[PDB]
Copies of this chain bind each other. A is one copy, B any other.
């Protein structure tokens, strides 16, 4: 279900520190800051490999799994895309995703366990589609947003592409839309 893009106060202006409960989670699990924002850790990378044809044959692990957490101090996952589709599974909290297709269409939906209100707890972002995400205030998980992501073939930086500023965003969605989504781009 479509969702209005109405970033909360701490999303537009990140807080210097996250609630102690989330900091503890970060420390105990040894999560590290992701280049696109948020905290993460690869917890699984298949022992099995596969060969795939890539536009310029390469080898990749069959799959990779990560924990990905957004917090009040790092509430945004900046726009980026992967050649491969990515499976997302909600575990704790609430968040919102914004997708920008190559043709320019923008889609946004909310993630949470209240499906009766349009929220989803499983979602796949097709390869080639730019995605960004931001934290939604929620009391159930101390204003945090924890999910698991699985990519097949397994993650490789060579298949990753981050969006470059509002300039590149402008080419895709136009000036007005680019301005509205600027807070989600590098």
For A47, the closest partner residue in chain B by CB is B85
- Give the number of chain A interface residues (Cβ < 8 Å): 27
Identical chains in the assembly: 2
The interface residues of chain B lying within 8 Å CB-to-CB of A108 are none
Residue with the highest number of chain B CB atoms closer than 10 Å, among A43, A85, A115, A148: A148
When the two chains form their complex, are residues B92 and A113 in contact, meaning their CB atoms are under 8 A apart? yes
A28 close to chain B: CB less than 8 A: yes
When the two chains form their complex, are residues B62 and A153 in contact, meaning their CB atoms are under 8 A apart? yes
Residue with the highest number of chain B CB atoms closer than 10 Å, among A87, A116, A124: A87
When the two chains form their complex, are residues A63 and B65 in contact, meaning their CB atoms are under 8 A apart? no
A163 close to chain B: CB less than 8 A: no
Provide the bound-state CA to CA distance between A124 and B48, in Å: 13
When the two chains form their complex, are residues A63 and B115 in contact, meaning their CB atoms are under 8 A apart? no
Which A residues form the contact surface with B (CB < 8 A)?
28-29, 43-44, 46, 48, 50, 62-63, 65, 67, 85, 87, 89-92, 113, 115-116, 121-122, 124, 148, 150, 152-153
- 29 CB contacts below 8 A, A to B, read A28-B115, A28-B116, A29-B115, A44-B87, A44-B122, A44-B124, A46-B85, A46-B152, A48-B85, A50-B50, A62-B152, A62-B153, A63-B63, A63-B87, A65-B122, A65-B124, A67-B122, A89-B89, A89-B91, A89-B148, A90-B91, A91-B113, A91-B121, A92-B113, A122-B148, A148-B148, A150-B150, A150-B152, A152-B152
